[PDB]
RNA sequence: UACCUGGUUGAUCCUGCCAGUAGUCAUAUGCUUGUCUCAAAGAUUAAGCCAUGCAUGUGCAAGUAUGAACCAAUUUGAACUGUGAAACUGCGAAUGGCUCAUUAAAUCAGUUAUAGUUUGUUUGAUGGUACGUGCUACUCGGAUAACCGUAGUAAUUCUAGAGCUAAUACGUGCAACAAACCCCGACUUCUGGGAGGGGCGCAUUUAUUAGAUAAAUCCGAUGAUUCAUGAUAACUCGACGGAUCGCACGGCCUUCGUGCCGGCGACGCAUCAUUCAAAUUUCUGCCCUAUCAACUUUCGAUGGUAGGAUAGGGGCCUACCAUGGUGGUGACGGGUGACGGAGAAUUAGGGUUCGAUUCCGGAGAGGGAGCCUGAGAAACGGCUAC
RNA sequence: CCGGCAUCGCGCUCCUAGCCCGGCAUCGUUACUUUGAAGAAAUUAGAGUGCUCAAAGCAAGCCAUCGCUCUGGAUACAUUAGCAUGGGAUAACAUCAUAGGA
RNA sequence: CCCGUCGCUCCUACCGAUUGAAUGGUCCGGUGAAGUGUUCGGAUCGCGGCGACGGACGUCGCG
C-alpha cells in the first residue's frame, strides 16, 4: 500500500513545567499583544526556532 | 523464492532513475539483455520519463508497436528493454539521436549526437581467449563476442565499432597517459586521465586519475571506461565536461547567474 | 527422500542442530546404480537438474580400455572384477565403479600388436628398434586377459572406460591380488 | 613406496609414470615427471614439495586444490589429525559502549602439506580453498617456528 | 532547556527510596467532537476454525478451421476465402499477496569465493559428413480431440464404447566438399620417396600428447592451474544437426512450363559468451541464564583414502583406518510473551528500550512426510499417504 | 603549514626511469592514526523550490506567461569487520652472545 | 517508647504420604502407510516375417 510512504511530522513540543507562573505570563503577553489563537502557535514557532538555532550552533561549533 | 522475481518495488528501483517515491508501488524492473539492470536505462524511462514522449504505460508501448525507437542499430521493441552506457538511441522518423552518457552527479543523459557519429559506439573489452577449432574471440562488457580480433587487442582495453559492418573500426590500449570516464562509484561521470595504477596481487587494482582542471581521484579498474588516446577524446561530452565540482562552486554558479536575469 | 544438506549433521562443537527448513528439492541425491558386470546390457536415462540427463547403467558387458605406453584404445569385453579399494564385498557381487580392477579379454590388444611387403619391412623394421614389453604385460597376455583399471563412473555417464596397469601400479596390484 | 600404504595405489592425476620416451627437463607434470604449480600471491614452493615423494590430493603446490578468497595468518594450536591442523586467530574486539577492547578468538581448520612439519604453537599463515572436509577451508602455505 | 519539587524531624544536615512533573510512528478505554489536508487499521490471545463470492489465465499477418457458425456469397475448376466461437498445441501459473509458527553462528548484515556448479528467457557470435563401398543429398506414417452418437452413477471440469479429421502434437527419415590430417596398405624402386584404394560433423566417455626462454630464430590467459585451446586413438544402442508458418511480389527463360531464382520476417534445435538469478561459501558481529562445566563419539562425533550420490565442493552417504573436535575468550544445555536487518522512541554528550507490519533476506501454507510436471517447486488457489 | 636537501642517508637488474640525476619494489609482525575506494532505497540531517501556509511532495519557472526555452531531481552520516594509502610518537607480540653475522 | 509467645480475621507462599494428576517433547525396541529406484511379470498393441500357407492361425520381428 503506497501513500504509506508519505512522512509527515510534529510540530511544537508542550512545556516541561504545566504550571509556572512567568512562563504562564511571559506567554499570555505574546498570546495577547499579537493575537494568536492558543499557546500551541506559540510554541511551535519556539520549536521552528529551536531547531534553527541547534543547526546554527552544529556550523558554529566547527571550523 | 522459488524461482526468478519479476517484479521491481519502486523504492528497490536504481537511484538515479529518479523515479519518485509516491508514484506507484512498482518500477519497471528491466528486462535480461545487454546492461546489469542496475547500470542500465530502461526504454519506459527514456521515452515517458526524460523525453517525455509519453505520459503513460500504455502510451510507450503505442509507440514501440510503431517499430520507431531504435537502440545501437536495430529496432528494439521491447518495453523494458535494457538500454546502456554508450548506447545509441535513434529515432528516424523525427531523425533524432543520442549516446547515452553519464553526467557528473552519476545519472545516464541522453547526449544529442549527430548522423555522422551515430553509425559508430566504444566498447570495452572483457576478456579475449580462443574458442571452438582455436579461432581467438573477445568479449565486451555489453554482451557483443567478436571473432578474429585483432591480435593486439587484451582485456579492458576499448574499440571502436561500426554499426553498419558490425566489425571493428579502431581500438585503444588501456594504459597511463589516456583520457577515461568512470562509470561506478561516487566518481562515476567523471571524465578524467590515468595517471596511476597499482597492482595487488590477489585483489582489485586501482587506478590514480587527474581531472583537466586539476582534480585529483581514484577508482578501481572495473570502473574505468577509456574515451579517447592521448589527452583528445574520441566522443562527445555532455553539458558539463565531465569536471565534478563542490557544491559551493554550484552555489556561486546559480547565484552568479541569478546576477544576469 | 536423500539427501544432501548439512542440518542432520552435528555442529563441530558437537551440539545439536535445530530444523529451521524442511528438505528442497536441490538438495536431493539418489540412490546408486551399483553397475553389475552382466551380458544383458541396460543403462537408464534420468532426467537432471537443468533439463539434463545422466545415463545411470544397470548392467554392462563391454568397455573401452587404453594402453598408455601403446597409445591405443580398444573396445574390449569384462571378464570379472578382481579387486575393490573400498569394499570386498563389491567384488563378491561383481560391481563396477570407478577405480575397480577388472580382467580384460585382450585379443583386440593381442590383434593391434601383431602390427607394429618391402616398403612394409621397412617399418616393422623401423619399429622394433624400440620394442620393449615389460614381461609382466607379456605373461597377462599368454594368460589371455589384462588387468585393468576402470577410469570413468558408470552410475554417471553409463560406461566403463579405462585403462590397463603398467609399472609401478602393474606390480602394486599384483602383490595385492597374492 | 613410503607414500603407498593404503588399500589402492596412490597416484597424482594426469601424470602418465610408465612413459615410453621419458626425460627430465619437459615441464613440470610431463614425460612422467611429478606435477608441482606455485600458488601464487607471493609464495614460494618448498623445495620438499619440488623433490617430493607423497602424495596428495589437496596440497596447494601438488594438489588439485587452488588458493583464493582470504590469506589468514595465525598460531598453530593442535597437530593431531591426519593432515589437518587447528589454528588459533587472536584479536581484540572492541567494546562501544566502554570504550575498550576484549582478547577473543578463533579456530580455524587448515589442511596441512606433507611438504611441512609443524610443531604445537607456530606461526601459520592459510589459504583459503574449496571446502575440503566438513569444516576444513583453508590451507597451510608458510610456517615459521 | 545539560532543570527538578512534595513526603521520615520538635527543628537540622544527609543517605535513600516513594509520589509528582514530560514524551511515545504505543495499545486500550472514557467523555467530547464544527471545517481542510493527511492515513494506521484481527500483529499481540487462537500459525484457532471457516458458509459464500471472487483472487490465473492467455491469440498474433505469421502452429492446427470443410468438425458446427457469422459474413461475403462461385461464372458451381479452385476457396471454407473475410472474421471467428469451441478444441488440440504452446506458454504461464515457482512471480505477486499473506503471515512471523519453527529458528540464538542458525537466519541475517557488511565482506568474500566458485580454479566447486546450475541457469527457461534476453542479447552477440556461432553450426557441413545423417551415410555414399565419405568420389557434392537417397521417402513421406497412424491417431486423437472440437464434432457426431449409445450410456452409466445420487453425485463432480466422475467416467466407458463407437463414427470422422489436422499439426510447429507424436513417430520416422535424404544429407555440404579439398577430406583437410591420422592409421592401413596391392605394386613401384631402395625409398627421407611415390603410392592405387577401404574406414575419421556436433555431442558423450576414457586415455596419450602439445600447449614455448634466461642475459653473451619462443608465439593466447591468470595472483595462481595437467588453463583456454589443438592433435591422436577409440567409445555411445546420441539429447542434435528445420518434412514448419506469414505477407510481398519480380529480374530473367533452360522445356519459355507459379519456369532459373532470390528477398524481408515468425517460430524452433544445439554450443559458447552475456544478461536475469540461484545454490553452496570466507572473515567479523547477536538478548538473559553457571541453582547449565563438561559436551560429541558404537549408530558420523574430528580427520584420512577409495568410492557412490549431486548441477557441483563437502561425512552428504558407504567401506576401511586414525583418535580426534568444542570448552571460564563460557562450549553443551535452558529461557525467550525471539524471524534478522534497514530502521523506531527518547535523546546535552555517553546511553536505555523497541523493531509482527508495506523495503531487503529467510521461513510456512492445519501437523509431519513423499513426490510428479518443469529451466526453476520438495509447490499446497498441484498430487499421494498418514 | 609543507615540500626538496644537506650533517657521519645497508644496495638494486626488473614498472615508473632527469637534461652522469630525485622518488625501488620482498630477506619482524600488529594495534593506533591519516587519506581513499566500495558501500541500496526509504528513514535521518541537509541544498533548491510560495502544494495559498503547514504537515508535504519532487517539483517547477519563464516565455510575447504564442508552434517552446531553461531545467532540477544536490550533498552528507553510516560504529565493528574486510580492501588500499602515508605516519612510526604511544603500546603490544617476536628477538645478537653458540657470531650458524654481514 | 517498646519485644515475644498464645487466641481471633484475612492473604501469600513452602513441605508433603499418596508408584498423586494432566500434558508435550526426546531416546531406545517394534510395527509400518505411501511415494521413488530396482528385479521379475506380461493383460493388450504394434512390420502382424513366415510357410507364399486359407479375416483367421501359430511358428515372429523386435519394440
Ligand atoms: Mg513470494
Ligand atoms: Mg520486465
Ligand atoms: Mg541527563
Ligand atoms: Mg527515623
Ligand atoms: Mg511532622
Ligand atoms: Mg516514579
Ligand atoms: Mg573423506
Ligand atoms: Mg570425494
Ligand atoms: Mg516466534
Ligand atoms: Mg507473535
Ligand atoms: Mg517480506
Ligand atoms: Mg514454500
Ligand atoms: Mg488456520
Ligand atoms: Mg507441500
Request: hydrophobic share 35%.
Given at each position: 500500500?503506497?501513500?504509506?510512504?508519505?512522512?509527515?511530522?510534529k510540530?511544537?513540543?508542550?512545556?516541561?513545567?504545566?504550571?509556572?507562573?512567568?512562563?504562564?505570563?511571559?506567554?499570555?503577553?505574546?498570546?495577547?499583544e499579537?493575537?494568536?489563537?492558543?499557546?500551541?502557535?506559540?510554541?511551535?514557532?519556539?520549536?521552528?526556532?529551536?531547531?534553527?538555532?541547534?543547526?546554527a550552533?552544529?556550523?558554529?561549533?566547527?571550523? | 523464492?522459488?524461482?526468478?522475481?519479476?517484479h521491481?518495488?519502486?523504492?528497490?528501483?536504481?537511484?538515479?532513475?529518479?523515479?519518485?517515491?509516491?508514484?506507484?508501488?512498482?518500477?519497471?524492473?528491466?528486462?535480461?539483455?545487454?546492461?546489469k539492470?542496475?547500470?542500465?536505462?530502461?526504454?519506459?524511462?527514456?521515452?515517458?520519463?526524460?523525453?517525455k514522449?509519453?505520459?503513460?504505460?500504455?502510451?510507450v508501448?503505442?509507440?514501440?508497436?510503431?517499430r520507431?525507437?531504435?537502440?545501437?542499430?536495430?529496432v528494439?521493441?521491447?518495453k523494458?528493454?535494457?538500454?546502456?552506457?554508450?548506447?545509441?538511441?535513434?529515432?528516424?522518423?523525427?531523425?533524432?539521436?543520442?549516446?547515452?552518457?553519464y553526467?557528473?552527479?552519476?545519472?545516464?543523459?541522453?547526449?544529442?549526437?549527430?548522423?555522422?557519429?551515430?553509425?559508430?559506439?566504444?566498447?570495452?573489452?572483457?576478456?579475449?581467449?580462443?574458442?571452438?577449432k582455436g579461432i581467438?574471440?573477445?568479449?565486451?562488457?555489453?554482451?557483443?563476442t567478436?571473432?578474429?580480433?585483432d591480435?593486439?587487442?587484451?582485456?579492458?582495453?576499448?574499440?571502436?565499432?561500426?554499426?553498419?559492418?558490425?566489425?571493428?573500426?579502431?581500438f585503444?590500449?588501456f594504459?597511463?597517459?589516456?583520457?577515461?570516464?568512470v562509470?561506478?562509484?561516487?566518481?562515476?561521470?567523471?571524465?578524467?586521465?590515468?595517471?596511476?595504477?597499482?597492482?595487488?596481487?590477489?585483489?582489485?587494482?586501482?587506478?590514480?586519475?587527474?581531472?583537466?582542471?586539476?582534480?585529483?581521484?581514484?577508482?578501481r579498474?572495473?570502473?574505468?571506461?577509456?574515451i579517447?588516446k592521448?589527452?583528445?577524446?574520441?566522443?562527445?561530452?555532455?553539458?558539463?565536461?565531465?569536471?565534478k565540482?563542490?557544491?559551493?562552486?554550484?552555489?556561486?554558479?546559480?547565484?552568479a547567474?541569478?546576477?544576469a536575469? | 527422500?536423500?539427501?544432501?544438506?548439512?542440518?542432520?549433521?552435528?555442529?563441530?562443537?558437537?551440539?545439536?542442530?535445530?530444523?529451521?527448513?524442511?528438505?528442497?528439492?536441490?538438495?536431493?541425491?539418489?540412490?546408486?546404480?551399483?553397475?553389475?558386470?552382466?551380458?544383458?546390457?541396460?543403462?537408464?536415462?534420468?532426467?537432471?537438474?537443468?533439463?539434463?540427463?545422466?545415463?545411470?547403467?544397470?548392467?554392462?558387458?563391454?568397455?573401452?580400455?587404453?594402453?598408455?605406453?601403446?597409445?591405443?584404445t580398444?573396445?574390449?569385453?569384462?571378464?570379472?572384477?578382481?579387486?575393490?579399494?573400498?569394499?570386498?564385498?563389491?567384488?563378491?557381487?561383481?560391481?563396477?565403479?570407478?577405480?575397480?580392477?577388472?580382467?580384460?579379454?585382450?585379443?583386440?590388444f593381442?590383434?593391434w600388436?601383431?602390427?607394429?611387403?618391402?616398403?612394409?619391412?621397412?617399418?616393422?623394421?623401423?619399429?622394433?628398434?624400440?620394442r620393449?614389453?615389460?614381461?609382466?604385460i607379456?605373461?597377462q597376455?599368454?594368460?589371455?586377459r589384462?588387468?585393468?583399471?576402470?577410469?570413468?563412473?558408470?552410475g554417471?555417464?553409463?560406461?566403463?572406460?579405462?585403462?590397463?596397469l603398467?609399472?609401478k601400479?602393474?606390480?602394486f596390484?599384483?602383490?595385492?591380488?597374492? | 613406496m613410503?607414500?603407498?600404504?593404503?588399500?589402492?595405489?596412490?597416484?597424482?592425476?594426469?601424470?602418465?609414470?610408465?612413459?615410453?620416451?621419458?626425460?627430465?627437463?619437459?615441464?613440470?607434470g610431463?614425460?612422467?615427471?611429478?606435477?608441482?604449480?606455485?600458488?601464487?600471491?607471493?609464495?614460494?614452493?618448498?623445495?620438499?614439495?619440488?623433490?617430493?615423494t607423497?602424495?596428495?590430493?589437496?596440497?596447494?603446490?601438488?594438489?588439485?586444490?587452488?588458493?583464493?578468497?582470504?590469506?589468514?595468518?595465525?598460531?598453530?594450536?593442535?597437530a593431531?589429525?591426519?593432515?589437518?591442523?587447528?589454528?588459533?586467530?587472536?584479536?581484540?574486539?572492541?567494546?562501544?559502549?566502554?570504550?575498550?577492547?576484549?582478547?577473543?578468538?578463533?579456530?580455524?581448520?587448515?589442511?596441512?602439506?606433507?611438504?611441512?612439519?609443524?610443531?604445537?604453537?607456530?606461526?601459520?599463515?592459510?589459504?583459503?580453498?574449496?571446502?575440503?572436509?566438513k569444516?576444513?577451508?583453508?590451507?597451510?602455505?608458510?610456517?615459521?617456528?
Amino acid at each position: 500500500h503506497v501513500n504509506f510512504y508519505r512522512n509527515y511530522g510534529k510540530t511544537f513540543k508542550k512545556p516541561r513545567r504545566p504550571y509556572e507562573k512567568e512562563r504562564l505570563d511571559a506567554e499570555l503577553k505574546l498570546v495577547g499583544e499579537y493575537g494568536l489563537r492558543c499557546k500551541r502557535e506559540l510554541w511551535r514557532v519556539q520549536y521552528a526556532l529551536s531547531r534553527i538555532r541547534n543547526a546554527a550552533r552544529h556550523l558554529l561549533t566547527l571550523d | 523464492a522459488r524461482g526468478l522475481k519479476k517484479h521491481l518495488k519502486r523504492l528497490n528501483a536504481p537511484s538515479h532513475w529518479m523515479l519518485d517515491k509516491l508514484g506507484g508501488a512498482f518500477a519497471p524492473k528491466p528486462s535480461s539483455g545487454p546492461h546489469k539492470a542496475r547500470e542500465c536505462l530502461p526504454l519506459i524511462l527514456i521515452l515517458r520519463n526524460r523525453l517525455k514522449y509519453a505520459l503513460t504505460y500504455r502510451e510507450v508501448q503505442s509507440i514501440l508497436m510503431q517499430r520507431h525507437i531504435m537502440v545501437d542499430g536495430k529496432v528494439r521493441t521491447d518495453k523494458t528493454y535494457p538500454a546502456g552506457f554508450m548506447d545509441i538511441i535513434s529515432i528516424p522518423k523525427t531523425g533524432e539521436n543520442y549516446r547515452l552518457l553519464y553526467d557528473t552527479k552519476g545519472r545516464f543523459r541522453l547526449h544529442s549526437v549527430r548522423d555522422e557519429d551515430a553509425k559508430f559506439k566504444l566498447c570495452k573489452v572483457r576478456s579475449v581467449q580462443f574458442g571452438q577449432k582455436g579461432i581467438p574471440y573477445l568479449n565486451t562488457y555489453d554482451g557483443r563476442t567478436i571473432r578474429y580480433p585483432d591480435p593486439l587487442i587484451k582485456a579492458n582495453d576499448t574499440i571502436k565499432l561500426d554499426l553498419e559492418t558490425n566489425k571493428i573500426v579502431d581500438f585503444i590500449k588501456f594504459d597511463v597517459g589516456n583520457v577515461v570516464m568512470v562509470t561506478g562509484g561516487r566518481n562515476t561521470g567523471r571524465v578524467g586521465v590515468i595517471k596511476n595504477r597499482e597492482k595487488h596481487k590477489g585483489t582489485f587494482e586501482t587506478i590514480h586519475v587527474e581531472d583537466a582542471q586539476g582534480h585529483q581521484f581514484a577508482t578501481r579498474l572495473g570502473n574505468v571506461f577509456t574515451i579517447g588516446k592521448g589527452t583528445k577524446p574520441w566522443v562527445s561530452l555532455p553539458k558539463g565536461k565531465g569536471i565534478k565540482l563542490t557544491i559551493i562552486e554550484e552555489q556561486r554558479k546559480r547565484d552568479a547567474a541569478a546576477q544576469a536575469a | 527422500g536423500i539427501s544432501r544438506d548439512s542440518m542432520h549433521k552435528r555442529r563441530a562443537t558437537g551440539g545439536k542442530q535445530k530444523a529451521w527448513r524442511k528438505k528442497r528439492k536441490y538438495e536431493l541425491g539418489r540412490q546408486p546404480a551399483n553397475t553389475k558386470l552382466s551380458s544383458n546390457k541396460t543403462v537408464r536415462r534420468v532426467r537432471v537438474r537443468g533439463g539434463n540427463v545422466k545415463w545411470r547403467a544397470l548392467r554392462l558387458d563391454t568397455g573401452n580400455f587404453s594402453w598408455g605406453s601403446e597409445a591405443v584404445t580398444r573396445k574390449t569385453r569384462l571378464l570379472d572384477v578382481v579387486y575393490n579399494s573400498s569394499n570386498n564385498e563389491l567384488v563378491r557381487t561383481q560391481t563396477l565403479v570407478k577405480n575397480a580392477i577388472v580382467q580384460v579379454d585382450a585379443a583386440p590388444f593381442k590383434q593391434w600388436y601383431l602390427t607394429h611387403s618391402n616398403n612394409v619391412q621397412r617399418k616393422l623394421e623401423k619399429r622394433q628398434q624400440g620394442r620393449t614389453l615389460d614381461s609382466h604385460i607379456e605373461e597377462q597376455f599368454s594368460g589371455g586377459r589384462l588387468l585393468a583399471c576402470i577410469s570413468s563412473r558408470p552410475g554417471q555417464c553409463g560406461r566403463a572406460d579405462g585403462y590397463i596397469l603398467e609399472g609401478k601400479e602393474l606390480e602394486f596390484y599384483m602383490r595385492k591380488l597374492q | 613406496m613410503a607414500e603407498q600404504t593404503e588399500k589402492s595405489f596412490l597416484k597424482q592425476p594426469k601424470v602418465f609414470l610408465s612413459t615410453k620416451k621419458a626425460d627430465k627437463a619437459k615441464r613440470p607434470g610431463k614425460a612422467g615427471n611429478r606435477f608441482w604449480k606455485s600458488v601464487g600471491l607471493g609464495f614460494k614452493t618448498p623445495r620438499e614439495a619440488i623433490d617430493g615423494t607423497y602424495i596428495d590430493k589437496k596440497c596447494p603446490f601438488t594438489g588439485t586444490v587452488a588458493i583464493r578468497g582470504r590469506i589468514i595468518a595465525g598460531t598453530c594450536h593442535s597437530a593431531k589429525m591426519n593432515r589437518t591442523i587447528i589454528v588459533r586467530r587472536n584479536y581484540l574486539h572492541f567494546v562501544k559502549k566502554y570504550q575498550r577492547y576484549e582478547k577473543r578468538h578463533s579456530n580455524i581448520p587448515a589442511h596441512i602439506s606433507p611438504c611441512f612439519r609443524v610443531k604445537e604453537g607456530d606461526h601459520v599463515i592459510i589459504g583459503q580453498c574449496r571446502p575440503l572436509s566438513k569444516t576444513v577451508r583453508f590451507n597451510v602455505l608458510k610456517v615459521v617456528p
